[PDB]
């Protein structure tokens, strides 16, 4: 039973393939993840990129064993003589930084590879496709909305966990929360977790806490823990009105300058406060809609945008204290 092996830059356990080299999906496969894996070591490690013939690793037979085996135990004879040279005066490579944008794009894909077996028991953008399109919007949302460790980010209906994984990989939020309803992904996004943690030791990068739980969003426990976030992923472009309407309703407790990001406004971008709609969920909260994922289109043949909505209660203070003054009463009674 033949298999190729490559060594972990810092030590890990190494990755292990059976050959004949299995096949993730459509697009996957594990020589190009291969590949991929050594083009990313690389990309960590100068020194490694220095020693490999970079444009030949598309040269390559991926579906002759010697010819595969050749380029691991080329990768493997490098990753030693690195190891070599880190005993020497050379400082290591730095542990426990965050990955790279690039490279966290792959350890996904590869989490997803090992982790998901049907594609098609799942239903903008589908998982399979996660790495060229919501990855992008993630990423994006990353840099838009900036997190500190003071903040609690949780993703409603987290599906098998890609999104709560990339958040985890590339912020400082004291924690990342995950809550998934279905079993199907709820059981994959277990295998996803395990894969993450090990994936991640693999490459030596850290992420953030994280716990990916079973669990309806619109339970009463999750009540008073939407109430304590300060942060909130919610891909509801295609959830109905009434759930949406549950969820305005748990919005509304949330604290001062929490925000919400959504594939769906949950207020209107304009929303102008009256007597009529006091109540509505625009009373508290700024709208915007952040810069689309350029150059792709969802599933409808549209760019796809993603809303951020923050809490901001001194909206209704505003309109509260117009109405005090009879000047701007009048001017505001002009319908
Ligand atoms: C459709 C979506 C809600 N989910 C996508 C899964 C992957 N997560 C994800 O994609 N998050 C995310 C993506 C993009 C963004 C931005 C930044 C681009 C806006 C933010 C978050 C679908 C999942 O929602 C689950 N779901 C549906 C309802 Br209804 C529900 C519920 N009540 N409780 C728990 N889970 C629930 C279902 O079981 C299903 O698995
Ligand atoms: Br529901
Ligand atoms: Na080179």
């Known amino acids: 039973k033949l298999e190729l092996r490559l060594k972990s830059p810092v030590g890990a356990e190494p990755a292990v393939y059976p050959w004949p080299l299995p096949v993730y999906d459509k697009h996957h496969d594990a020589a190009h993840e291969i590949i991929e894996t050594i ?3 690389c990309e960590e490690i100068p020194d490694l990129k220095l020693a490999m013939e970079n444009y030949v690793l598309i040269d390559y037979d991926t579906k002759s064993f010697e010819s595969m085996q050749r380029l691991c135990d080329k990768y493997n004879r490098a990753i030693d ?3 070599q040279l880190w005993k020497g005066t050379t400082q290591p490579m730095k542990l426990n930084t965050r990955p790279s ?3 966290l794009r792959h350890i996904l894909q590869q989490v997803y590879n090992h982790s998901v077996t049907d594609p098609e028991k799942l239903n903008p953008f589908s998982p399979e496709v996660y790495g060229e399109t919501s990855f992008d919007l993630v990423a994006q949302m990353i840099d838009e909305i900036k997190m500190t460790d003071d903040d609690l980010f949780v993703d409603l ?4 966990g890609q999104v709560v994984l990339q958040v985890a990989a590339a912020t400082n939020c ?3 929360y995950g809550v998934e309803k279905a079993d199907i992904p709820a059981k994959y996004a277990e295998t996803m977790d395990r894969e993450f943690r090990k994936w991640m030791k693999w490459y030596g990068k850290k992420h953030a806490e994280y716990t990916l739980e079973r669990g309806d969003f619109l339970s009463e426990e999750w009540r008073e823990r939407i109430a304590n976030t300060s942060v909130i992923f919610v891909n509801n472009f295609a959830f109905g009105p009434e759930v949406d309407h549950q969820l305005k309703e748990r919005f509304a407790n949330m604290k001062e300058g929490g925000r919400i990001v959504s594939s769906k406004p949950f207020a209107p971008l304009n929303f102008r ?3 009529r709609n006091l109540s509505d969920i625009g009373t508290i ?3 915007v809609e952040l810069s689309p994922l350029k150059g792709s289109v969802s599933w409808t043949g549209k760019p796809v945008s993603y809303y951020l909505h923050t809490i901001d209660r001194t909206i209704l203070e505003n309109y509260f204290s ?4 009879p000047k701007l009463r009048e001017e505001q009674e002009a319908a």
């Open 39 to 41: 083009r990313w070591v």
């Open 322 to 325: 117009s109405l005090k003054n």
């Open 81 to 83: 003589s690195i190891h």
């Open 273 to 275: 406060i009256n007597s």
């Open 157 to 160: 209906g987290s599906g098998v």
């Open 101 to 103: 944008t690039g490279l």
């Open 285 to 287: 909260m700024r709208v």
């Open 174 to 176: 004291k924690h990342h």
